[PDB]
Amino acid sequence: ASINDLIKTHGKLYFGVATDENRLTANTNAAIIRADFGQVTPENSMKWDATEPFRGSFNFANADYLVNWAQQNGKLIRGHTLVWHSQLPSWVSAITDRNTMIDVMKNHITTLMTRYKGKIYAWDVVNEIFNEDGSLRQSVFYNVIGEEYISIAFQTARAADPNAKLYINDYNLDTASYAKTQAMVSRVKAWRAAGIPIDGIGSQTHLSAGGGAGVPTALQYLATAGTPEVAVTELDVATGDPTDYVDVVNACLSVPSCVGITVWGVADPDSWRASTTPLLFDASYQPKPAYNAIVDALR
Which reactions fall under this protein's catalytic activity (predicted)? Predict the structure, then answer.
């Protein structure tokens, strides 16, 4: 059974997965994804170190493969990710001139979003911009452009592709009482009230075992920020136990503005945290109990 088909019967938009060319061209990832998922996120091929390794020197081969594959198979695409302190080449983090940094940031956003204009359902416009205490991460964008860098990014993205949903994405938003979750709701409500075009809040939802239980309350709290939508963007669960997966599925089903769930990979060995077997398909590329547990929860 397809958990994507099943969740859409609940009025959600998708149940999707991260992937890229190295996965699609190997084993049975492509077959599982056609059959069982309805959306894809580039795991790495759209990041800054992959797309613009040197100033003005764009590489789109891998990203193009994912976008074409996704389109040919009618899968939704979430763009990931534009403004991020990680996996950032040194030529970006070294710049000390404010005007130069605005040019670099706006060029990167505009170029990527224009190349795929109209094809991308949501873009993670800024990623992981918060410290664990709820304060803004003082990345190079923060230090050189200023706190306005968030507003500039979102306005530039809206201008580049008015079709796309513009998201802010972050992790450890899994407990409503956590300082970071409070700060995410507060800031996004504030930025939207200043007219900044933030369409969705993405919650990565990289969980520890037992972490599922708090996600319903947290996801419902993120929805009170007032964005049109929220989403689970990078789900995986240490030990990969069914309890935590079904908890997140019900969290989503309980938030009317939560459009769907993306799982961060098809099969355990290919997971960035493979040693915790955190995914829904195993080393054999066969569905695990959590996957069947999701099937039973969606019927």
Answer: Endohydrolysis of (1->4)-beta-D-xylosidic linkages in xylans
